[model samples]
Target: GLVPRGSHMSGATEACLPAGQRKSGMNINFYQYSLKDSSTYSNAAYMAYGYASKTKLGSVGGQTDISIDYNIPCVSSSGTFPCPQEDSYGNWGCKGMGACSNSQGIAYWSTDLFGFYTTPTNVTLEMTGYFLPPQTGSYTFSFATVDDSAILSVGGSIAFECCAQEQPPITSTNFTINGIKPWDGSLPDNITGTVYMYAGYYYPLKVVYSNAVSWGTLPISVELPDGTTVSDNFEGYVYSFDDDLSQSNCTIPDPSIH
Candidate 1:
């Protein structure tokens, strides 16, 4: 018999199954289901996602400065990103480059999306936050890479980060890296590691990504506690070549629904 479009079909029709086995009617429920994680995992998101408070060591000093500096560590804050002028914390300039969106699926930008820049040499991205789960248990995550490099640190431990493997949110911008690997969107040989976390808690999540000569996706996946699995749709939203930016340019937390 032809099944009706979008119809709830009898899992085992009484006639199809032994009559005695189908005494109870078949009731079926189907769910066609679906970021704090609003951060982007793209060239712009990582390159331009932040503000420059100009703090030193442990203080927010230059809030009165001209513009938020989005300059990376190198020579000086001059020219375009476009250039690799030296680094973070306090008074970082946005370099006149504005903000954009990673719209769908974690703001990932591949070679296809690396056009905004005329000739970007090397690209790097940083993410720090809580990677939350609804349930709890030991999470063994295996991230992979190709022509790029990346690393993940969870709960004070290096979960994985050598040739692509990736962890929980332990929180740290101070991890180590030897190089970058290509994050093949579908790298079968994913680097692997583990961690333990409970549901509803913010486990510090930090990921440092680097794309070398050629750029690639930073692919990752996790085997959560209790056997449920998960992955990052985005390492995060927003990128900053310099500033640790945010949407502080707010519309008011108490704004009425327009």
Candidate 2:
């Protein structure tokens, strides 16, 4: 679920159920922030994960889990500093540092899926969440930049998919889901998913000012069949520079350079 952005924190997650039921159900969310400047040469991003228990009337038996997958693309400089170079066709290729060139645009890709569950008898439990996809239906989603891509799914079906070629500037887009079937609200229903993003420059050529930096935020609101709505916010924190050591030695040279 997504919540209001720039509220009071950078990341958050939560879940709740009506009274008279077991209080074992819990919601979880987490986030990590990195520096957001060009001097660092390091990109910044955040991650979150959690699990839920499936049971009824004080009975414990089932469980549900979720994870998020994402990526970030960046560019580097050239020269003896582990940069990339261009061939005859102007195609960028890594030279020194064995493919770790500073002039090369690197895409940080990762898949993080975490969850587990125990079986329960007679009781049917439903689980739902967001993830990178070709979702099975229509829904409201936030998107930005013409180079971005995304997808949505429900009941093991492809609900939606959005992908672009050229990377767009930092911005946010919104979307909605329609004609979604109603839930019974009896069994424990859960929703989980992941998102992947990679936006940055390549190599050899001067880093495009627009592609040199990028950032965006996505928030989601879950509406239960029982008129209950839960929202969660996913903001992509991108740090273009990482390996920065400019401020390492300040003031006059302490003879160390000599």
Candidate 3:
């Protein structure tokens, strides 16, 4: 028997089970740093290059914004695409560099599908939780996107990474680093890795998405050996600590703790 993939994306569908048996979606925390001007842009650039080391976990700002979401699949359409919340400028869209009004105006970026960017760029999202295997021996986790970058680690191993390591020089006219082009929301280019796992055990997972500038998106999905597809959702698949910790018997330590 395999771990049950709960029925749907919303609510605790597995609530009928005992507290220890309940499983839900992955917990994601969005940290948005203000990149109001060149000075701020440099600060963001510094963090972007450092990846995990630079992003402070669970810290809030003076005028901070926060939101929570459950299992959301990747972007499918223009209308369904989740954008960052409006900044002080009243713009709900993810603007280019130097577009925000307030010095501390970094759009409160949040998304359910693991894809999103803020109004003034330099936004980071860390998805932490356990990946419940429905029926597993080995699963191939992958993402198909051209621009931007994200690091996915499952069971303490990196699964995939793409495009650039360092963002383009701020002084340069081009925004994206060389070889890494801006994404048009297309998943044509793919980076993938495979991992072996048991069906019922909770596997540790950590995914960090960093958007240096402009529009940033990460379209990540997984294919089970049996051909089933799983996206970041709550239906007995991905469980974020903030959302399902008390109910889950997950032994995997939260990546943010370090």
Return the lDDT, model 3, position 42. Answer: 28
From the highest TM-score down, the ranking of the candidates is 3, 1, 2
Compute each candidate's TM-score over C-alphas: 0.36, 0.19, 0.47
Candidate 2 clash figure, as a count: 55
RMSD to the hidden true structure, all candidates: 21.9, 25.1, 14.0
Give the top-scoring candidate (lDDT). 3
Please give the CA lDDT of all the candidate structures.
0.31, 0.20, 0.40
lDDT tens readout by residue for model 3, 1-258: 355553244211111111233335544455554443223222333323333444444422111111222211122233333334332123322323223333222333443323433332555555555566767466877665522445556652221111111111112111111113223333346677676555655555555555544445555668888988765333566543223324443232221111
Q: What is the model-wide C-alpha lDDT for candidate 1?
A: 0.31
**Candidate 2 at residue 112, lDDT?**
20
lDDT of 2 by residue, 1-258 (tens): 354332234111111111122211212211111222222111110000000121221211111221121122223343333121131113433343233332223322222211322111011111222222122222232222111111222211121111110111112111122111122212112322322211111000000000111221122343333334344432121011111123232111111111
